[PDB]
Amino acid sequence: RLEVKGVVNNITVYDDFAHHPTAITATIDALRAKVGQQRILAVLEPRKHELATSLQDADSVFIYQPWQVSEVLANLAQPAISADDVDELVMRIVQQAKPNDHILIMSNGAFGGIHQKLLTALA
The amino acid occupying position 28 is: I
Instruction: Quote the Cα angle for 66-42-83, to 5°.
Output: 30
117 vs 31: CA distance, rounded Å: 22
Elucidation method: X-ray
CATH T-level topology, domain 1-123: Protein-Tyrosine Phosphatase; Chain A (3.90.190)
Resolution, angstroms, 1 dp: 1.9
CB 65 within 8 A of CB 75: no
59 vs 57: CA distance, rounded Å: 6
Q: How many CB atoms lie within 10 A of CB 3?
A: 11
Instruction: Quote the Cα angle for 93-96-102, to 5°.
Output: 70
> Domain residues of the chain, as ranges?
1-123
* Three-class SS state of 6: strand
